[PDB]
Amino acid sequence: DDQALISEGKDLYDVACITCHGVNLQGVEDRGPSLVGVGEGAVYFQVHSGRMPILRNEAQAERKAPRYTEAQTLAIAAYVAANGGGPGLVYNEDGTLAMEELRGENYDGQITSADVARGGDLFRLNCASCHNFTGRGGALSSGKYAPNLDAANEQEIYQAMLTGPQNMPKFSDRQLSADEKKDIIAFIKSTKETPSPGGYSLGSLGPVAEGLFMWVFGILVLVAAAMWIGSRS
Amino acid sequence: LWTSGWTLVENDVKVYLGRDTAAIAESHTDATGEHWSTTGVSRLVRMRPED
Amino acid sequence: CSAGQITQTSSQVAAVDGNQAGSANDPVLVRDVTVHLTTDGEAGVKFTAINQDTSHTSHTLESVTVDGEEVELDDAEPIERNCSLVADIQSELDLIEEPEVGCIQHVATSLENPGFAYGGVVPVEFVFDTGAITIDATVSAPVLESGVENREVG
Amino acid sequence: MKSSAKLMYGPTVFMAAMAVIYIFATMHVSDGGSVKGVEWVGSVALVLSAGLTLMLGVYLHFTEVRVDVLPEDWEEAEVADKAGTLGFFSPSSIWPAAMSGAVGFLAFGVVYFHYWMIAVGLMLLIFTITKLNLQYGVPKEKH
Amino acid sequence: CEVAPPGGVLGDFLRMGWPDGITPEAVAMGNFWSWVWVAAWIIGIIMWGLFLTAIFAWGAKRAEKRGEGEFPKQLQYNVPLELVLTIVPIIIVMVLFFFTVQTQDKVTALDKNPEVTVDVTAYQWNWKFGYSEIDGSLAPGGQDYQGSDPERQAAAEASKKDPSGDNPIHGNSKSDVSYLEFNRIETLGTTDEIPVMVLPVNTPIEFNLASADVAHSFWVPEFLFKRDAYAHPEANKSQRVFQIEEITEEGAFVGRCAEMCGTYHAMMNFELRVVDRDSFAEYISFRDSNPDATNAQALEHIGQAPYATSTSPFVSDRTATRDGENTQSNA
Ligand code: HEC
Ligand code: HEC
């Protein structure tokens, strides 16, 4: 099954990626890195989230609407895997890519809150420095930034942790084991998918959003009330 | 301000580089009631150079 | 300002342990050269030798060595232009499929461990019929089957 | 407003004739170096361009049959004919600049697509437009 | 046109920098261009003369020295002359449009009976050529060669729908590539090598354009012709096929992209190499017999340059190119 999939992988690779990665994935001098040994997971992350192709050299690549569908993504990943392998996709017990089954070490049918606690402390330890407390993203040096984690599915999160896309450090499966990674996924999805008890969240950016809101519009409405109650002379 | 934990390595103690496992305390419940235990867990853990 | 001639996205290399040698102008390139040493003690040299000699002077990997010590490898076909000889330890080599379309060939490797340390770096010396290529490579364990392993306390 | 009401009939009829000619042409001529078949972009544009000019012309004519022999159109009018009030004109107003800034804020909001910027931009925009339209009718200060 | 330009230095001036051209319709376009330039020069000089007359003849100081007074004749309307001068450009553009229709129609007509048809794919940022069909005269087998690859094109037709189901664009997947033709004899352009399509002399040839990515254009300056390559040309109602009656002389000719496609738009060159008709049979039999061999090896088999002599690949480093040596040494 994979042997014929690799052919479509090659056909798609020849028509898009050579200009940056070479016919033999060796890379190009300043135009793109070598893809030997990156594996299925890096290709899946890069193509499925739509980061590749990169049509402009920049401080950082951008997520966008993907140029290929799922089957084409797996075909290109199979072709790249044939050149040296690498980290692999997390296949579930039936053979499909794992989605919604990575939400915690002890997932049954709903997010276990103990996993959420451990994953919250893990995310605060490692991930929250570049992203923020709830994964709303953050800034870096010279025009680079850490994206907001609301866009990615669970497989993309796992392969992001595994591969270290551009400036993200790698988190191998022996630094952060599968239980730790799945608890991190559980915490990310819990924070994403739970409404704030205290009303509208103001984006959860912290003091900046709350400040801007009050110190512009909250005081503006009260001076409007004062003008209603007072006089202009 | 001249000292830290690593000062214990001043020819006194063997000090490993401990990684944080972020482990919570674990609950245990029976007829006596639910109580939390840290007797079987460890937050800091040693690490080999291939991790 | 970030789209200038010096750009952050352009200078990047792959997020892999393997070093690499050769420019776009060089005849034969080695990509992803690494010394693998599984936890069970077996070891070898992962790499990929790509031929891009515009003279079409097809080569044959005569030998590879790590710190002068031999590494076993056999059945290496000549590499004509735009072809890749992928080499890895047999256990890891079994995980990926040989492509029936394309020029790639898979070859297995193994070396006796003289006592290399995880984390360190050791020279690797390739010699092909047309010349020798030297490159320092790190020592590390192979990648786990992703998702199967848990942090175990004891 | 007689001459300008009626001079608009040339452009509109020319555009309408070009629209029908073009629709028949592209739907029938199977010339090499091109593909047969009616194209809707262009034809729709031509018919609604004829529509714009026809709307202008017909409204102007429908109005002009009402108006009298204005002195500006009388070929031998005297300067004393138009003596009187010409009309009311705004002396000054800060609100055009304000609502330009409001539209700018809204446009920047849709650039980055921060939803709060879009909402605040629309609110600020209708506020500035309202302040523009009520400028010369705000009540006197109620004691 | 059927009538040749004046020739000589006058023709060179009227050319005015056009390539001579290597096809019949290239000659036609060049002749039409030369005579149109003659008429344009007539108009240009015969109105620059009137402006110069205003500068030197109709000056105010001259007429005041002559005693003409403070003002001229104050003429406003000369209706018959105005109508004549209105009728003149009408006839000029009319008679011009007649020959325009003539030359245009003999250029664009798709009835030239190709012996060779080459499918061309444009992508960001290089060219991929594939021989689609070859007449039995030039084909290896005696019978007509058909180059469509069954398995790889079957993958293309299977890409149309159902990647577990998204199908947004009129019931097809947004990443459809069924419009691309995949052939078994292909030349693939790279940043390390300028692709070279090999064509024979004196045969009607056909080009079938398409684009994997954003819109490109195929421009051979020696054809004096260029055509846009689009993704889904049928969906765009764009004519993706164009035919040349023949090429009339051998040689290597650069061809460029003439449509703004992206960052590396300038780096997207190719070469069109026209070879003796007897050598083309050797080339195609060589490529068919041992497909693993590269394009350069086939060109060596002919006995000509393995790489594009017209243009060398650009240097791919963004710092080394500062000193003007932006050319890669192919060998
Ligand atoms: C700063 C050094 C980072 C740390 C620490 C972590 N990540 Fe990160 N991450 C970072 C960058 C610069 C990027 C963008 C990469 C790119 O090529 O665009 C990312 C991206 C992700 C993503 C993808 C988000 C998306 O929208 O596709 C995910 C899911 C992600 N990162 C997760 C993640 C986790 C779970 C981390 C802690 C283990 C973590 N990252 C660390 C920078 C940094
Ligand atoms: C240039 C025109 C590109 C094309 C076409 C494609 N990619 Fe690319 N890729 C490009 C750059 C400049 C970079 C480095 C910047 C970055 O975002 O990392 C990359 C990187 C990758 C990677 C990451 C490798 C890693 O070690 O993590 C992968 C996996 C990758 N590219 C794959 C890929 C594939 C499969 C493409 C065609 C389907 C493809 N890229 C297009 C530039 C360009």
Curated annotation (Swiss-Prot), chain B:
Organism of this sequence: Corynebacterium glutamicum (strain ATCC 13032 / DSM 20300 / JCM 1318 / BCRC 11384 / CCUG 27702 / LMG 3730 / NBRC 12168 / NCIMB 10025 / NRRL B-2784 / 534)
Family assignment from sequence similarity: Belongs to the Rieske iron-sulfur protein family.
Observed phenotype of the null mutant: Cells lacking qcrCAB show strongly impaired growth in glucose minimal medium, which indicates that the bc1-aa3 pathway is the main route of respiration under these conditions.
Protein name stated in the entry: Cytochrome bc1 complex Rieske iron-sulfur subunit
Subunit details: The cytochrome bc1 complex is composed of a cytochrome b (QcrB), the Rieske iron-sulfur protein (QcrA) and a diheme cytochrome c (QcrC) subunit. The bc1 complex forms a supercomplex with cytochrome c oxidase (cytochrome aa3).
Location(s) in or outside the cell: Cell membrane
Top-level taxon: Bacteria
Gene that encodes it: qcrA
Function field: Iron-sulfur subunit of the cytochrome bc1 complex, an essential component of the respiratory electron transport chain required for ATP synthesis. The bc1 complex catalyzes the oxidation of menaquinol and the reduction of cytochrome c in the respiratory chain. The bc1 complex operates through a Q-cycle mechanism that couples electron transfer to generation of the proton gradient that drives ATP synthesis.
UniProtKB/Swiss-Prot annotation, chain C:
Record keywords, A-Z: Signal
Keyword Protease listed: no
Highest taxon in the source lineage: Bacteria
Binding partners and assembly: Has been detected in a cytochrome bc1-aa3 supercomplex; its deletion however leaves complex activity unaffected.
The protein, known as: Uncharacterized protein Cgl2664/cg2949
Source species: Corynebacterium glutamicum (strain ATCC 13032 / DSM 20300 / JCM 1318 / BCRC 11384 / CCUG 27702 / LMG 3730 / NBRC 12168 / NCIMB 10025 / NRRL B-2784 / 534)
UniProtKB/Swiss-Prot annotation, chain D:
Enzyme kind, highest EC tier: translocase
Signal peptide feature range: none
EC annotation from Swiss-Prot or TrEMBL: 7.1.1.9
GO cellular component terms listed in the entry, alphabetical order: plasma membrane
Spans traversing the lipid bilayer: 7-27, 40-60, 86-106, 107-127
Predominant localisation class: membrane
One matching Pfam family: Cyt_c_ox_IV
InterPro entries: Cyt_c_oxidase_su4_actinobac (IPR021050)
Topology class, membrane: Multi-pass membrane protein
Gene Ontology biological process terms in this record: electron transport chain
Keyword terms of this UniProt record: Cell membrane, Membrane, Translocase, Transmembrane, Transmembrane helix
Annotated catalysed reactions: 4 Fe(II)-[cytochrome c] + O2 + 8 H(+)(in) = 4 Fe(III)-[cytochrome c] + 2 H2O + 4 H(+)(out)
Source superkingdom: Bacteria
Subcellular location, record wording: Cell membrane
One MF term in the entry's GO annotations: cytochrome-c oxidase activity
Description of how the protein assembles with itself and partners: Associates with subunits I, II and III to form cytochrome c oxidase. The 4 subunit cytochrome c oxidase forms a supercomplex with cytochrome bc1.
Record function comment: Part of cytochrome c oxidase, its function is unknown.
Family recorded in the similarity comment: Belongs to the cytochrome c oxidase bacterial subunit CtaF family.
Name recorded for this polypeptide: Cytochrome c oxidase polypeptide 4
Designated gene of the protein: ctaF
From Swiss-Prot, chain E:
Spans annotated as Disordered: 140-175, 307-331
Cofactor(s) annotated in UniProt: binuclear copper center (CuA)
Keyword RNA-binding included in the entry's annotation: no
UniProt cross-references to SUPFAM superfamilies, sorted A to Z: Cupredoxins, Cytochrome c oxidase subunit II-like, transmembrane region
Transmembrane segments: 36-56, 79-99
Gene Ontology molecular function, alphabetical: copper ion binding; cytochrome-c oxidase activity
Binding locations of Cu cation A1: 216, 257, 261, 268
An example Gene Ontology CC term for this record: plasma membrane
Compositionally skewed regions (Basic and acidic residues) per UniProt: 149-164
Enzyme Commission identifier(s): 7.1.1.9
PROSITE patterns in UniProt: COX2, COX2_CUA, COX2_TM
Major location category of this protein: membrane
Name of the protein in its database record: Cytochrome c oxidase subunit 2
High-level lineage: Bacteria, Bacillati, Actinomycetota, Actinomycetes, Mycobacteriales
Protein's gene: ctaC
